[PDB]
Design an enzyme around this catalytic site. Structure first.
Site, mmCIF file in Angstrom:
data_model
loop_
_atom_site.group_PDB
_atom_site.id
_atom_site.type_symbol
_atom_site.label_atom_id
_atom_site.label_comp_id
_atom_site.label_asym_id
_atom_site.label_seq_id
_atom_site.Cartn_x
_atom_site.Cartn_y
_atom_site.Cartn_z
ATOM 1 N N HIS A 133 -4.517 -5.228 2.717
ATOM 2 C CA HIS A 133 -5.180 -4.457 1.676
ATOM 3 C C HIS A 133 -5.766 -5.326 0.578
ATOM 4 O O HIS A 133 -6.434 -4.801 -0.316
ATOM 5 C CB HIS A 133 -4.205 -3.446 1.066
ATOM 6 C CG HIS A 133 -3.746 -2.397 2.027
ATOM 7 N ND1 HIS A 133 -4.317 -1.147 2.092
ATOM 8 C CD2 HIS A 133 -2.774 -2.415 2.968
ATOM 9 C CE1 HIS A 133 -3.719 -0.439 3.033
ATOM 10 N NE2 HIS A 133 -2.777 -1.186 3.579
ATOM 11 N N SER A 146 0.818 -1.211 0.000
ATOM 12 C CA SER A 146 0.000 0.000 0.000
ATOM 13 C C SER A 146 0.851 1.260 0.000
ATOM 14 O O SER A 146 0.616 2.199 0.753
ATOM 15 C CB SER A 146 -0.928 -0.013 1.201
ATOM 16 O OG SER A 146 -0.176 0.077 2.397
ATOM 17 N N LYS A 174 -9.296 -2.355 7.367
ATOM 18 C CA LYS A 174 -9.309 -1.737 6.040
ATOM 19 C C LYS A 174 -10.547 -1.799 5.153
ATOM 20 O O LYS A 174 -10.976 -0.783 4.623
ATOM 21 C CB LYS A 174 -8.054 -2.143 5.264
ATOM 22 C CG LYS A 174 -6.889 -1.214 5.541
ATOM 23 C CD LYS A 174 -5.649 -1.961 5.987
ATOM 24 C CE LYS A 174 -4.739 -1.044 6.786
ATOM 25 N NZ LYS A 174 -3.510 -1.723 7.276
#
Lengths: 187, 187
Positions: free
Chosen positions: B147, B119, B179
């Protein structure tokens, strides 16, 4: 005057048993074997309990039969000066640290080969120091008493008798009946 | 809104069991655990199955919690370039040959750490090649799907779904519910 065959097939008699027991009692050990030739004994001994992953530390003045027996197995060989013990200790430590060549893995085994009396110098082997190092660094001891057995000591028991060493800290002993007993063979 | 204590003393309820079963079914694995913080999960994970005789090969762009978790255990660390697999193979071979530093003994264990989606770049990890090398050189694989899980794939199962890889060749998977699930914790 004739033998049948190999000891494992028909060759054994009761006389072989009596001789083995008598030799074991005489030396100060538990059991023994007798062979028909000393040279053959040294040549074919090491082939049984050594491989290419073990190491042999031998004095520079050993006999030829020991050299041939070591060469037939495949083990590695390093030598030290005659009568130098500090060199022996240093070599042992360095070879334990280094490990197998090209790979540096630990040595699967380490064996020290010496001779009771070197029959070109007349000198003896420092048996107490060898036993000390043997105990300390977890090595093994192999002694070749061809000129020592039968002829030296207060009663003729070899170098163990001379140095008052208990004949138990020496892992393997071998010799011949040719030199001081007027016969042929080995044990 | 109150908890009793640690999960091993009075903290467990039936909801924890239901969540663990549901997560294990969703991912494609057999069992799972859930913790109250993702950072804590990474920090305290590696401390359980690594020592100073094992080695960790990690990408240069991993998260900080993985670095702290590795530092707390004591294992050795080496890194490889981001997205280079030939470098990874070369490093694996050289580190298997060399062995532990200062002693050259064999590495007791080797673990490869990667991330499903980094990320800061938006790039993916070459999972098929990692599984191939993992199979060939007898290493282990640890993937961090923070992610990736929930948000990528034909149905949202992560990178295993994206690459059609059977989610069995990956030894350990972990992620967070923060997330893409609008919650807190990790698994």
């Amino acid at each position: 005057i004739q033998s049948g065959g190999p000891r494992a097939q028909i060759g054994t008699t009761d006389l072989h048993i009596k001789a083995e027991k008598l030799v074991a009692r005489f030396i100060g050990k538990e059991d023994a074997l007798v062979f028909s030739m000393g040279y053959g004994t040294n040549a074919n001994l090491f082939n049984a309990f050594l491989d290419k992953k073990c190491l042999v530390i031998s004095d520079e003045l050993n006999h030829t039969s020991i050299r041939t027996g070591v060469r037939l197995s495949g083990a590695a060989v390093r030598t030290f000066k005659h009568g130098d013990m500090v060199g022996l200790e240093k070599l042992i430590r360095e070879q334990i640290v280094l490990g197998q060549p090209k790979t540096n893995r630990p040595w699967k085994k380490i064996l020290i080969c010496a001779e009771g009396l070197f029959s070109m110098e007349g000198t003896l082997c420092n048996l107490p120091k060898l036993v000390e190092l043997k105990k300390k660094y977890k090595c093994y001891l192999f002694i070749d008493e061809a000129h020592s057995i039968g002829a030296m000591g207060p009663t003729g028991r070899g170098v163990c008798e001379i140095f008052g060493v208990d004949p138990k800290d020496v892992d393997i002993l071998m010799g011949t009946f040719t030199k001081s007993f007027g016969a042929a063979g080995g044990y």
